[PDB]
């Protein structure tokens with residue numbers, strides 16, 4: 245590999261790390277991946293500059309991201325162009341993702357139009373191809389969530405944030421990391437397994453179908469994953485949950501996606517399907 249950018253070049257392209265949103269004329273794009281993501285124009289290309297943002301742990305999150313990215317190059321993974329360590333903050337430089345994150349697009353943040361079911365199927369498929377790639381290369385993401393699934397100019401799914409990623413090639417840890425609302429029961433307990441990434445992708449699929457965030461304090465249920473139980477203990481059905489902000493979603497394909505999410509969300513890690521099966525089931529859904 246990557247370019248080694250100076251902290252000062254990245255200051256100039258990001259207009260001295262402007263915390264102002266894009267709408268007002270600033271450079272801040274969003275925060276939530278152990279830092280703030282800014283917009284910039286480096287080497288004649290539009291870039292995304294992640295300014296990180298224990299201090300020891302955060303430096304290891306930086307070093308792992310570059311480590312994973314160096315080995316891992318796929319069309320469903322975000323492309324890291326370079327980095328900065330020389331200055332007062334740790335910066336990561338990526339190819340700009342014009343359609344931001346899946347989370348933001350499912351909530352229509354900034355007035356973007358709702359994603360069609362057709363686009364939603366392509367995103368689900370692409371994200372599974374990116375997880376498959378990581379799993380085939382003995383990497384466990386540890387933080388699969390819609391905020392970490394980025395979208396390009398063609399709405400191609402691009403997995404990002406490999407700062408918490410772990411190589412294999414079942415282990416345990418004292419430092420439990422990830423997003424609570426997406427995490428597998430064993431992962432919340434300290435277990436490091438690719439089966440936990442499958443569970444997290446199951447929550448993502450429920451966000452795709454429903455357009456609902458994994459967690460909402462002002463909602464019943466507060467956690468999206470509880471809906472699997474509401475549907476099973478026939479209080480409600482999947483149709484009562486389908487995102488109303490779509491006009492092309494047929495029940496057959498939606499039920500087919502829920503079937504995959506349901507299988508992914510099995511509480512027994514050993515009973516969950518592997519990524520290649522998830523990928524296979526998602527391909528059969530379209531075609």
Ligand SMILES: CC(C)N1CCC(c2cc(NC(=O)c3cnn4cccnc34)n(-c3ccc(C4CC4)cc3F)n2)CC1
Nearest residue numbers: 273274275276281292338339340341342344345354391404
């Ligand atoms: C059409 C308009 C309304 N769009 C234009 C695109 C804009 C946008 C662009 C980006 N982000 C990127 O372009 C991006 C590229 N690689 N990368 C790796 C990690 C994180 N972010 C990125 N984010 C973005 C910024 C922060 C995060 C972090 C999870 C918070 C995720 C993101 F996708 N938001 C959002 C507004």
